[PDB]
Amino acid sequence: QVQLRESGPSLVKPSQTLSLTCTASGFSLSDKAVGWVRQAPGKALEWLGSIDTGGNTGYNPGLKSRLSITKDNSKSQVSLSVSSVTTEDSATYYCTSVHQETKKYQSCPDGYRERSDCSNRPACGTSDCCRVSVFGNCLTTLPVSYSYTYNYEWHVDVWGQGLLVTVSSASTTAPKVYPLSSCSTVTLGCLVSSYMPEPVTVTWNSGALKSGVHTFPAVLQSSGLYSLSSMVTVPGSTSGQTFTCNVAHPASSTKVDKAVEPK
Amino acid sequence: AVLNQPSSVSGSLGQRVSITCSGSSSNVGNGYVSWYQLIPGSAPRTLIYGDTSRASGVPDRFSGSRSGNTATLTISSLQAEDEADYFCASAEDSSSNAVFGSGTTLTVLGQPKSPPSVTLFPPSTEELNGNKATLVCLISDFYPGSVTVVWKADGSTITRNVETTRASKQSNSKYAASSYLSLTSSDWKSKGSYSCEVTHEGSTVTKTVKPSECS
Ligand SMILES: [K+]
């Protein structure tokens, strides 16, 4: 299937433009469009827009004035820009492969009959739909044109993995990593304090220690920075061992392996 | 527009559960509704398109239907892993303009209740060397997924500089949360004890740390 990969900044400042890119690789004759959907925390999925092979774009009408979607064939990339962002634009942004089709129909409204279905000609001039009389025959007078109706089809065929974008005035900040210890089973931890943006990764003993590990989702403090903790419970039998918390925060180029000891 | 879905729906295992999605002639009545399943930590998954067609890999117990301006997603035999948010969608006025439903949270009944485990960690020496003190209250293995946390010091409730996360689902289907009390090293030393009291379904589990007796 089509391979979608979002790229762009995970952190932008309010009032700036958020620019994301998707590389969409697959069948070169694919007639799917490439679109963008987002979901802000606690909210519904929200359509942003799409572009197709013909270069035709469509947008969420409510958001259109802030959006620009373009493509660059030479890079196999579709770009999205969201202008003048606020914290309301913090969301996971998903690139998507989208089915888009329109089917158009014509019919004669009630009380009228398609002119070709009338008998005698000229049934009602050359109009589309002749009036039907009470007796149920065509009349020549006051004919109407077809009523045209369109059926629109949209669905997401393939979802990208999404990119979380946070809009914040907080600047990129490296965490301070602290070992946690309590005052037959010993519980150890690490506090990854005051970083920006998400995410951080935490493993124990360079990945060797997985069982009994609980890494908690981050809290956002009033400072505007995140903190998270990880803890591990191990048998008191192993208390003589050396334990380390491996913390990485790619955004600030931080990589720390913190030794954690029972007090 | 936003399609009208019930905020929540519940069912027991093996039961039939249905989620409605009501709109207008200009969206749902257009006759090509799609449905998506969203589970935290995963990208959305397409379930149904064109009112009734199942996407690839989607089990037979999922089916969609539509009657005029109301679409319905039916799960014929509810399974534990069907717990998720479900969103309907439809094009409106154009094939490149899509409106979503408000979303429905589907709970599968019968999960055993479980009290939280609580571990309270005091400030580390290294943090205190920086004149800061964070107390970390880690709360795990609870169900249903809501707790309230109260912090105390020498019998007084603390509200300032407390931040508590929402409850998040663990890999074992129970819930976790954490609460942070951010103090100065001076404030930390100025109290006889601090407590994190976690209340869950009417029951409270309390942990306590005492600065003068902490390492
Ligand atoms: K193409």
B178/B137 Cα distance (integer angstroms):
6
Task: For an interface test with B, give the residue of A43, A45, A78, A93 to mutate (most B CBs within 10 A).
Answer: A45
For A170-263, CATH gives: 2.60.40.10
Could you check whether B1-110 and B111-211 share the same CATH topology?
yes
How far apart, in whole angstroms, are the C-alpha atoms of residue A5 and residue A36? 12
Distance from CA of B6 to the nearest CA of A (A): 13
Distance CA B117, CA B125 (A): 25
Q: Does domain A2-169 have CATH number 2.60.40.10?
A: yes
Minimum Cα–Cα distance from A95: chain B residue: B43
Inter-chain CB proximity A45 and B134 less than 8 Å = no
Give me the residue spans of the domains in chain B.
Answer: 1-110, 111-211
**CATH architecture of the domain with range B1-110:** Sandwich (2.60)
Whether B180 sits inside 8 A of A227 (CB atoms) is yes
Per-window interface: B 192-211 vs A, CB < 8 A: 209-210
Q: How far is the CA of A100 from the centre of ligand 1 (A)?
A: 13
Tell me whether residues B161 and A222 touch, CB distance under 8 A: yes
Count Cα neighbours of B146 within 13 Å in the Cβ-side half-sphere: 2
| Residues in chain A closer than 8 A to B46 (CB atoms) | 155-157, 159
CATH top-level class for B111-211? Answer: mainly beta
Enumerate the CATH 2.60.40.10 domain ranges in chain A, comma separated. Answer: 2-169, 170-263
CA distances from A203 to A254, B125, B175 (A): 14, 22, 21
Name the DSSP class of A133.
Answer: P
With tokens 């979303």, the residue in question is B103
**What HEC string does chain B produce?**
CCEECCCEEEECCCCCEEEEEECCCCCHHHCCEEEEEECCCCCCEEEEECCCEECCCCCCCEEEEEECCEEEEEECCCCHHHCEEEEEEEECCCCCCEEEECCEEEEECCCCCECCEEEEECCCHHHHHCCEEEEEEEEEEEECCCCEEEEEECCEEECCCEEECCCEECCCCCEEEEEEEEEEHHHHHCCCCEEEEEEECCEEEEEEECHHHCC
